[PDB]
Design a protein around this ligand. Structure first.
Ligand SMILES: [Cl-]
Ligand SMILES: [Cl-]
Ligand SMILES: [Cl-]
Length: 163
């Protein structure tokens, strides 16, 4: 475990993370994809061997000894708000199981279903709150990665609000 488990946020490419494992915002088919998924495919392509997994699940594949946790959030273009919200919560619960199983002291994690799976809606708060619900019972240091300057400020505010 971490000595004093924390949440932090950084605005940069998650492929450059300083943590013991990474969560990919994956598609269900284990394809290279776009956004975070394509950055992850370029950095850890070996981790895409048999990485296909259903919506609401996470599947870990090792790149050398470095664990890549493929977490499949729902595409809100296809899911109802109700069913999508359940699947997004479930994906983060499966991430927390994997992080615990792996014994890592830190994890890099993007906000699932906030990019091309958002169905055109701002889901920062929805996605971050499901992240916290899953990860609060873990003792890994969690580093959240984002790309937008306004999102960095809002995520940082949300973390600081609870401390
Ligand atoms: Cl960067
Ligand atoms: Cl997305
Ligand atoms: Cl972002």
């Amino acid at each position: 475990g971490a000595m004093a488990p924390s949440y932090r946020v950084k605005r940069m490419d998650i492929a450059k993370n300083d943590e013991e494992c990474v969560v990919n915002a994956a598609n269900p088919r284990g394809l290279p994809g776009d956004g975070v998924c394509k950055a992850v495919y370029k950095k850890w392509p070996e981790s895409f061997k048999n990485s296909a997994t259903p919506v609401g699940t996470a599947k870990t594949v090792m790149c050398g000894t470095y664990p890549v946790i493929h977490a499949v959030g729902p595409n809100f273009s296809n899911y109802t708000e109700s069913e999508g919200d359940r699947e997004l919560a479930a994906a983060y619960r499966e991430v927390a199981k994997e992080v615990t199983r792996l014994g890592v002291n830190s994890v890099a994690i993007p906000l699932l279903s906030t990019g091309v799976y958002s169905g055109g809606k701002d889901r920062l708060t929805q996605s971050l709150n499901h992240l916290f619900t899953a990860m609060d019972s873990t003792d890994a240091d969690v580093v959240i990665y984002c790309r937008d300057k306004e999102w960095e400020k809002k995520i940082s505010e949300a973390i600081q609000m609870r401390t």
